[PDB]
Design a protein around this ligand. Structure first.
Ligand SMILES: CCCCCCCCCCCCCCCCCC(=O)OC[C@H](COP(=O)(O)OCCN)OC(=O)CCCCCCCCCCCCCCCCC
Ligand SMILES: CCCCCCCCCCCCCCCCCC(=O)OC[C@H](COP(=O)(O)OCCN)OC(=O)CCCCCCCCCCCCCCCCC
Ligand SMILES: CCCCCCCCCCCCCCCCCC(=O)OC[C@H](COP(=O)(O)OCCN)OC(=O)CCCCCCCCCCCCCCCCC
Ligand SMILES: CCCCCCCCCCCCCCCCCC(=O)OC[C@H](COP(=O)(O)OCCN)OC(=O)CCCCCCCCCCCCCCCCC
Ligand SMILES: CCCCCCCCCCCCCCCCCC(=O)OC[C@H](COP(=O)(O)OCCN)OC(=O)CCCCCCCCCCCCCCCCC
Ligand SMILES: CCCCCCCCCCCCCCCCCC(=O)OC[C@H](COP(=O)(O)OCCN)OC(=O)CCCCCCCCCCCCCCCCC
Ligand SMILES: CCCCCCCCCCCC(=O)OC[C@H](COP(=O)(O)OCC[N+](C)(C)C)OC(=O)CCCCCCCCCCC
Ligand SMILES: CCCCCCCCCCCC(=O)OC[C@H](COP(=O)(O)OCC[N+](C)(C)C)OC(=O)CCCCCCCCCCC
Ligand SMILES: CCCCCCCCCCCC(=O)OC[C@H](COP(=O)(O)OCC[N+](C)(C)C)OC(=O)CCCCCCCCCCC
Lengths: 49, 105, 95, 75, 108, 161, 80, 78, 183, 506, 60
């Protein structure tokens, strides 16, 4: 069985429950995603050697 | 040392071994810096999220799209309804396409 | 929050407007305008005006004051001294 | 160390004397209070001296390792 | 601004809510002046930095004072011009001092 | 067809139009129910029942407090809103529902490989109790200490004498 | 839509409505913890989730008691 | 003192009688609760007089023999 | 334990709908460099009935396979392929013997388990006949390690917990052996 | 000692009859408990042994030399606070009986002391959430201990809501860290300090910044401190800062490992705003407790500059500043409670209403203190001049050490701003001194037979009856001279701060 | 002497992601409440554990 690992719909659609300092950073701030994309980019760049 | 990453049956889960090897590397006296343990940290984070492997899957799907390859020709067959895991799909000799019973085991 | 926001001029201005809705003799009303003589109010007409003035300022004249008030200015003085805002619920103030 | 404890006892007399002015009483009011106050801060002064003497020993031992660390940096 | 309008419509008979909404409320000129002043500040700060090959307190003083004056002329129309110049000089001097001190930290 | 989206949209619509305190406690019930049902499927059946066991008892105590405080304020206070603007607000919030911006993490599916090494299989609640009473017994005792403080705290705040 | 602080309109105009908002906000953190623990197959996170439920229940009781006494004080003459 | 409240440290037996008569919901609830730990302290007596404890259950995974692998093992080969 | 996972079938199709579960098949076999093996074809009930007979017959191969896993240092699935095939063949041999020597007794036992929620305590009569037949034809004895020989629960004469509903085939077969075998 | 003795006090208080005398004697029992707790803690915990750091209770708690010093400070300051409720502060029943009215006063304090001491020791995100709520809940109960007071219950309602939001932010930060890493122990998290979102720890600090009244969340703190009774404001405005600031220093110590410059700027931005509001905010106020609330905000900003730098000099600066500020905080509130006996009695314009909960509520109620009690007035003047930073008082060395850490780490902007803020705040500090003494020569030939102290009956007209009780006057005398005469022992005290190590070693 | 003393103490040694203090003295996982032998992913042998990093006590 292959399935998604996304958060519950209530966590990302409730008018109140989805608002927090960390959830806003995940949703609107690219600081986390830009840094984690480096690890993904390092994978391809380390093939040729 | 407190227990972390405990499986649903009281034992270590899938990613405890990665976490344990990180702790052993960090607390080992022979090391001068934490640089040798950097690769072990990536493996533990890869065990939980699989972000690099999902990225690899993203490239393969995108690469096949530009080549014109059909997803059903190079992918893996799958069934979306559990009641339709029929004996014909399972390859049984006398396998029929009638739905299987999943109401009450 | 719970404090009077009235002024002598505003109270007098609204007092005149209320008294001009009746059949008073004169429309020129000031502090020294007497109910009995200048306005020509009898026992029941005066009490009708006093209750009407009570409704405007959300105040209640006591028995002694209402049975001895003579001029409009005394009504103005009573309203200024005794008026209070009605207490609100807990949600109105702290929220 | 007697001079040190004499100073601490002098400080205790000052605290009691300053207390008398706060309470608005003559400075001779209940003279036994100065004896209690002086001995209280003498006990604090005896403990304070042990704290400082102990701290001097600890500082010297740490300084030795700090000098070794500085020598590696200056090389 | 639109969200705060909904809060006004959610209830207008509660004095406590109205008092705090009035403090955060901005006039129409402010809603227009503020983005223009900040936008002008961003442009002039970057434009002056490129001229000098680096950020200086002189450029930040000029960028802050001019941008503040541009903004002040929008939402502070009912004031003397010299009054807006004095505030623009004051605002520009503060950010010039900010750059002179090395922003929030000297770093390396 | 994810019907959880429709339920949350209905719940969100009434949140913006709720006026009295009774409609607010009804919002709370209309919030726990989607949480419990979405927990009952997918992730964790154990905590779906735990949420029902604990929060439903809190709701009733919350409700009985409302009966002692309602003071006619919202039975005649006017609200303006507007049907068009309320739908526009909900429509714009519906546009963005991606809580995370790791597209690979959200679009690529993963599987786990089961193993037979755990011949001793028990429920997750037993493992939680095994660790809570042995590994983290201090947390359990401090929680009881907090519960003791609440019992004393409630009495001193509420009791007249 | 979150950055314009849209949730400030979804909260009602009563003191008890603020209490309900806090319970929902804390409940969102617990749901997230259960989401992470279930994926990781980590019972430590489920221990954290249970603690968050118990602690949040204590918070509601203390806040309600303060609000109960606050409402009591205004209606406290009781001359009758 | 025909019906006085006994002092616990002076008449412990009479003090217990007061609560057993006037507060039955307290005296006997504690009495039932006390027997729990009491039986727990009597466990060593049962360990020596009645029977011994059971062998611990093999709830720790597969029992691995504490020895090196047998390199001389064959059979069922390819 | 009915906790939902990503490794097996969940409780209901609503869980699949929320997870968007795809039941994925692979049409590729093991590479030719790995020698082929014949997989065990016994279902749950026969395996539970023959669990102690597989352990008795294939104890050294079970231990060797498990010792390979521990000594592989994380590379168990790949390194211990050779040891895995020994266990599969040995386990298959036990089931093959049960179908050639004790088929009537073997089938009586695991059909009782299917009739009684797969609980050992509810099929003592059928198990006793099976245990006797296996010992007399295969020299294999059920043993529960860690306890004295006479304190084994399957040999208990008067168990506290007994099946609610008797299995008629087990009752008839048990009586046929009581009078005949023990004259 | 604390936990075991607390249970005994809880049962004993509910058994004995309700009376003011028994409550006061029970308060003295709580004083003995804290004194015994201090003796036990000093017997087993030493600075040298704890330098490395020792884990406790399955690594859920971690105690080091830095943590141990604050715990000893917390116990000592709590001892001085219990003296207020364990003894007379004015000697008048109409005033002093408020402290003896609530029996659970000592019980709630003992609950909070356990939370205060354990908070800097937290080594797990789970126990961090548990302890921070244990401390927060105890503060709400103490704020609402006078449940017959409209302001006390209103403040506690405000305190509960603001703190609960901060607790949610703290919980939200810890949960987000668990999602990224899957670990709950801080030391395990430190292994991945370079691979977790470091701004999630900034979310954790934001929740902690709310609980200490930092800007822009300052508003609720000023409102609560002014409305709450002086005996309650004295505790809730100082004790939470003793533990949370220590925990913030530890968290900032871990954050500086990766040295995120963006993280420092955000904290610098909040410190800059707090100095502006802390200085200009108190310029136009008429309440003394409102003035002290702005003073509290400004001084916390000064300590946060040392915390933000997080260097060897920061340990010396923070430890010294927190100790001397607490002593000054106790001294000022001790004097405020006592001097209520010099208030004139009416026998009116502005219809000023003064309640029994806060007898001293306005700055001008301190008028003619130079004449009423010259020794108490000078003691207040010494304390105020310490807050200003006049050398060689304790306050100057606190700001002197903070400036050293700030300028050494390159915070030139904050160091200059903190000195401009100090000059601005001197204006309202000097206003207190103006009220005390600037009218002495005109009111020297005045008659005051209407003061509160004048209502106290005399014993025999021959006994020399002091106006102030022995205990509270002695505490003021001791604290005043320690602030004044710190130059005598300043060198040795800093040497003690030299030995307080947070994983420095070498 | 005083200037030399203050220079030693006031010097803050550089910390980075390669050199910092972690207060863990043992490797976890030697014993689990149940099912200690899982998928054999625990490769850390406690019978041949190398000496752990020890904390430095400058006063000893
Ligand atoms: C409001 C008006 C207040 C005065 C305006 C700012 C004056 C500041 C100044 O001295 O002039 C600087 C500014 C040009 O900016 P600058 O950094 O000098 O660019 C490099 C040119 N070589 O000159 C101007 O743009 C003007
Ligand atoms: C867009 C969202 C809202 C903006 C963010 C606000 C929150 C962050 C600011 C931190 C301070 C929080 C202050 C409380 C929040 C402000 C709420 C507010 O906007 O109220 C407006 C207030 C009243 O304005 P008023 O004109 O009297 O009423 C309007 C009626 N038409 O007007 C005010 O007085 C508010 C200003 C308070 C003073 C803050 C000053 C901070 C320090 C600034 C200078 C920095 C000091 C260092 C300078 C040198 C630096 C190098
Ligand atoms: C469960 C089956 C039996 C119940 C079915 C009742 C259906 C009514 C709507 C159920 C709640 C859906 C979500 C809405 C949140 C609560 C909002 C509310 O106050 O109830 C809606 C009801 C509609 O009447 P209306 O006049 O439009 O609203 C007042 C306008 N000033 O206005 C009212 O105040 C009437 C309230 C009646 C009592 C309802 C108590 C709450 C019921 C919750 C049980 C279902 C749980 C939520 C399921 C949907 C989740 C989105
Ligand atoms: C104080 C007295 C405690 C000693 C005691 O009562 O017995 C302890 C007992 C150890 O004695 P033993 O049974 O001989 O050990 C077995 C060795 N194979 O150990 C036991 O048998 C367990 C005793 C359980 C009761 C101790 C706790 C009672 C109070 C609970 C609170
Ligand atoms: C009551 C005062 C008791 C003072 C005890 C100070 C103390 O706790 O020990 C010093 C402590 C470090 O102690 P440590 O290094 O761990 O062990 C060596 C101790 N010789 O260092 C510390 O952490 C103590 C920090 C607080 C210092 C407080 C200074 C005294 C406060 C003024 C006392 C006023 C006394 C008023 C008397 C009222 C009764 C009349
Ligand atoms: C030689 C010795 C020198 C010693 C002194 C050195 C410093 C001198 C400072 C000079 C500037 C202040 C003097 C002039 C200001 C006069 C203020 C004023 O006239 O009114 C206030 C003004 C609004 O004007 P209005 O109230 O209408 O008055 C009628 C004017 N026709 O209100 C305003 O518009 C002012 C602008 C709004 C407030 C801005 C605040 C931002 C921060 C300002 C700097 C504060 C820095 C503090 C740093 C520590 C705290 C962070
Ligand atoms: C009406 C009153 C007005 C004011 C009058 C003032 C008179 C002063 C009295 C004389 C005092 C005296 O003689 O002090 C001398 C003694 C003995 O010094 P030592 O043991 O050698 O210490 C070494 C001194 N070095 C370093 C200068 C060599 O020090 C004391 O006891 C100090 C008293 C405590 C001061 C407060 C700071 C320390 C607090 C510790 C806990 C935080
Ligand atoms: C070994 C260390 C401790 C010192 C030994 C003495 C302890 C106190 C017991 C004596 C009895 C007593 O305190 O009696 C109470 C006295 C007198 O008070 P009064 O106002 O005159 O009472 C009025 C009585 N008439 C009517 C007879 C006049 O108070 C004092 O003198 C206050 C000073 C307390 C002692 C000093 C403590 C210093 C601690 C500071 C260190 C940090
Ligand atoms: C007195 C200081 C005078 C400095 C003059 C200066 O800094 O000159 C004015 C600067 C321009 O300097 P710039 O363009 O950044 O550099 C110059 C060119 N360079 C790059 C080649 C070097 O701008 C400003 O108005 C900054 C605001 C001045 C604030 C001063 C605050 C001082 C506080 C007290 C510190 C102890």
């Amino acid at each position: 069985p292959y399935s998604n690992t996304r958060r519950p719909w209530v966590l990302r659609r409730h008018i109140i429950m989805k608002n927090s300092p960390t959830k806003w950073a995940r949703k609107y701030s690219s600081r986390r995603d830009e840094r984690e994309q480096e690890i993904k980019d390092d994978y391809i760049r380390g093939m040729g050697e | 040392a407190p227990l972390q990453q405990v499986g649903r049956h009281g034992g270590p889960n899938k990613c405890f071994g990665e976490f344990q090897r990180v702790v052993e590397c960090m607390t080992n006296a022979k090391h001068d810096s934490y640089e040798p343990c950097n690769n072990l940290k990536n493996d533990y984070l890869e065990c939980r999220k699989h972000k690099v492997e999902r990225y690899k899957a993203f490239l393969m799907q995108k690469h096949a799209e530009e080549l014109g390859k059909d997803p059903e020709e190079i992918g893996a067959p799958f069934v979306r309804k559990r009641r339709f895991l029929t004996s014909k799909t399972l390859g049984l000799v006398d396998g029929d396409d009638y739905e299987i019973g999943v109401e009450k085991i | 929050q719970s404090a009077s926001t009235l002024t002598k001029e505003d109270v007098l201005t609204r007092s005149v407007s209320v008294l001009r809705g009746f059949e008073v003799k004169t429309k020129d009303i000031d502090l020294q305008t007497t109910f009995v003589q200048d306005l020509g109010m009898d026992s029941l007409d005066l009490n009708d005006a006093l209750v009407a003035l009570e409704e405007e300022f959300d105040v209640v004249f006591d028995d002694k004051t209402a049975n001895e008030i003579k001029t409009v200015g005394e009504v103005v003085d009573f309203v200024l001294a005794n008026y209070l805002p009605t207490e609100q619920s807990i949600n109105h103030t702290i929220r | 160390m007697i001079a040190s404890l004499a100073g601490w006892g002098l400080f205790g007399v000052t605290v009691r004397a300053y207390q008398q002015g706060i309470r608005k009483v003559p400075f001779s009011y209940y003279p036994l209070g100065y004896v209690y106050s002086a001995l209280g801060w003498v006990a604090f002064g005896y403990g304070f001296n042990l704290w400082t003497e102990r701290n001097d020993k600890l500082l010297e031992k740490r300084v030795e390792k700090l000098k070794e660390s500085r020598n590696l940096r200056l090389s | 601004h639109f969200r705060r309008l909904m809060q006004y419509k959610k209830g207008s008979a509660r004095p406590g809510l109205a008092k705090y909404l009035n403090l955060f409320s901005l006039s129409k000129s402010q809603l227009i002046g503020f983005p223009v002043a900040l936008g002008a500040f961003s442009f002039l700060s970057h434009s002056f930095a490129n001229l000098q090959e680096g950020q200086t307190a002189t450029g930040e003083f000029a960028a802050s004072s001019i941008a503040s004056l541009i903004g002040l002329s929008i939402f502070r129309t009912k004031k003397p011009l010299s009054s807006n110049v004095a505030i623009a000089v004051g605002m520009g001097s503060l950010f010039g001092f900010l750059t002179w001190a090395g922003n929030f930290n000297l770093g390396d | 067809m994810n019907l959880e989206i429709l339920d949350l949209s209905i719940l969100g619509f009434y949140s913006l139009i709720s006026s009295n305190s009774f409609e607010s406690i009804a919002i709370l019930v209309a919030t726990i129910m989607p949480v419990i049902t979405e927990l009952w499927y997918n992730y964790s059946q154990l905590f779906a029942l735990l949420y029902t066991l604990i929060y439903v008892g809190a709701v009733v105590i919350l409700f009985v407090f409302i009966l002692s405080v309602i003071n006619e304020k919202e039975e005649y206070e006017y609200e303006y809103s507007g049907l068009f603007i309320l739908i526009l607000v909900l429509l714009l919030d519906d546009l963005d529902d991606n809580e995370s911006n790791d597209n690979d993490y959200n679009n690529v599916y993963i599987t786990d490989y089961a193993d037979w090494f755990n011949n001793y299989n028990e429920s997750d609640l037993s493992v939680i109790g095994n660790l809570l009473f042995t590994e983290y017994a201090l947390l359990l005792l401090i929680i009881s200490f907090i519960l003791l403080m609440s019992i004393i705290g409630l009495i001193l705040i509420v009791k007249k004498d | 839509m979150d950055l314009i602080l849209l949730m400030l309109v979804a909260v009602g105009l009563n003191i008890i409505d603020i209490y309900i908002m806090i319970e929902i906000l804390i409940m969102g953190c617990t749901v997230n913890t259960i989401y992470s623990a279930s994926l990781d197959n980590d019972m430590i996170g489920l221990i954290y989730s249970l603690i968050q439920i118990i602690i949040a229940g204590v918070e509601s009781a203390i806040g309600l008691s303060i609000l109960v006494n606050y409402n009591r004080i205004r209606n406290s003459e009781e001359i009758e | 003192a025909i019906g006085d409240y006994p002092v616990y440290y002076k008449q412990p037996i009479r003090w217990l009688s007061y609560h057993a008569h006037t507060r039955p919901h307290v005296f006997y609830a504690i009495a039932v609760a006390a027997l729990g730990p009491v039986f727990m302290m009597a466990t060593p007596l049962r360990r020596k007089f009645l029977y011994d404890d059971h062998e611990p259950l093999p709830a720790n995974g597969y029992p691995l023999p504490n020895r090196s692998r047998d390199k001389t093992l064959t059979g069922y080969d390819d | 334990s009915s906790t939902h996972t990503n490794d097996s079938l969940n409780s209901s199709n609503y869980v699949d709908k929320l997870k968007d579960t795809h039941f994925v098949f692979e049409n590729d076999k093991l590479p030719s460099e790995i020698p082929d093996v014949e997989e065990v074809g016994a279902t749950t009930a026969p395996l539970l009935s023959a669990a102690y007979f597989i352990g008795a017959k294939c104890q050294d191969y079970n231990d060797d396979f498990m010792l390979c896993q521990k000594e592989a240092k994380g590379n168990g699935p790949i390194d211990c392929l050779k040891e895995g095939r020994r266990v599969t063949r040995c386990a298959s041999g036990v089931l093959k013997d049960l179908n050639t020597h004790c088929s009537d007794e073997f089938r009586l036992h695991w059909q009782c388990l299917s009739f009684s929620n797969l609980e050992y305590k509810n099929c003592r009569k059928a198990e006793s006949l099976l245990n006797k037949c296996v010992f007399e034809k295969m020299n294999l004895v059920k043993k529960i390690p860690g306890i004295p020989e006479d304190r084994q629960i399957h040999l208990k004469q008067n168990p506290v917990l007994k099946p609610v509903a008797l299995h008629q085939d087990s009752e008839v077969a048990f009586k046929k052996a009581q009078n005949e075998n023990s004259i | 000692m604390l936990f075991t003795s607390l249970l005994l006090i809880i049962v004993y208080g509910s058994l004995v009859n309700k009376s003011h005398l028994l409550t006061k004697l029970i308060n003295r029992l709580g004083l003995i408990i804290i004194i015994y707790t201090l003796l036990i803690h000093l017997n087993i915990n030493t600075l040298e042994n704890l330098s490395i750091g020792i884990n406790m209770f399955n690594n859920l708690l971690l105690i080091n030399s830095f943590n141990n010093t604050i715990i000893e400070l917390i116990l000592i300051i709590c001892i001085l606070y219990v003296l207020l409720i364990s003894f007379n502060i004015t000697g008048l029943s109409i005033i002093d009986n408020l402290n003896y009215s609530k029996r659970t006063f000592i019980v709630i304090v003992l609950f909070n002391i356990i939370g205060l001491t354990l908070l800097p020791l937290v080594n797990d995100i789970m126990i961090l959430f548990i302890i921070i709520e244990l401390q927060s809940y105890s503060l709400y109960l103490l704020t609402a201990i006078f449940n017959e007071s409209h302001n006390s219950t209103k403040s506690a309602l405000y305190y509960f809501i603001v703190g609960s939001i901060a607790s949610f932010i703290i919980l939200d930060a810890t949960v987000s860290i668990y999602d990224d890493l899957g670990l709950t122990n801080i030391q395990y998290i430190l292994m991945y300090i370079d691979k977790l979102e470091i701004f999630d720890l900034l979310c954790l600090l934001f929740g902690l910044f709310i609980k200490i009244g930092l800007a822009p969340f300052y508003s609720y703190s000023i409102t609560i401190y002014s409305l709450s009774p002086t005996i309650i404001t004295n505790y809730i405005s100082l004790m939470p800062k003793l533990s949370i600031l220590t925990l913030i220093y530890i968290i900032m110590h871990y954050i500086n490992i990766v040295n995120n410059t963006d993280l420092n700027y955000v904290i610098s931005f909040l410190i800059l705003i707090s100095m502006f509001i802390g200085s200009f905010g108190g310029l136009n106020v008429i309440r003394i407790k409102t003035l002290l609330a702005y003073s509290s905000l400004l001084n916390v900003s000064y300590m946060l500059l040392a915390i933000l730098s997080n260097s060897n000099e920061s340990i010396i600066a923070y430890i010294y500043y927190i100790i001397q500020y607490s002593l000054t905080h106790i001294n000022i509130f001790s004097i405020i409670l006592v001097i209520s006996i010099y208030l004139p009695i009416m026998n009116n314009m502005l219809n000023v209403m003064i309640t029994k909960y806060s007898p001293i509520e306005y700055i001008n109620q301190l008028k003619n203190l130079f004449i009423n009690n010259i020794f108490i007035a000078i003691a207040l003047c010494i304390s105020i001049f310490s807050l200003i930073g006049i050398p060689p008082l304790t306050g100057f060395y606190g700001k002197y050490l903070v400036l050293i850490s700030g300028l050494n780490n390159g915070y030139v902007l904050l160091s200059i701003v903190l000195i401009i803020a100090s000059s601005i705040s001197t204006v309202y500090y000097a206003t207190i001194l103006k009220v005390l003494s600037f009218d002495t020569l005109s009111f020297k030939d005045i008659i005051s037979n209407n003061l509160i102290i004048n209502t106290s009956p005399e014993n025999n007209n021959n006994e020399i009856k002091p106006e102030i009780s022995n205990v509270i006057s002695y505490v003021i005398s001791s604290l005043t001279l320690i602030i004044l005469l710190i130059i005598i022992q300043y060198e040795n005290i800093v040497k003690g701060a030299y030995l307080v190590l947070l994983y420095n070693w070498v | 002497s005083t200037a030399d003393l203050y220079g030693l103490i006031s010097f803050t040694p550089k910390r980075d992601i390669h050199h910092y203090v972690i207060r863990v003295d043992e490797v976890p996982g030697k014993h689990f409440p149940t099912n200690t032998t899982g998928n054999f992913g625990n490769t850390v042998d406690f019978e041949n554990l190398e000496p752990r990093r020890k904390p430095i006590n400058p006063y000893l």
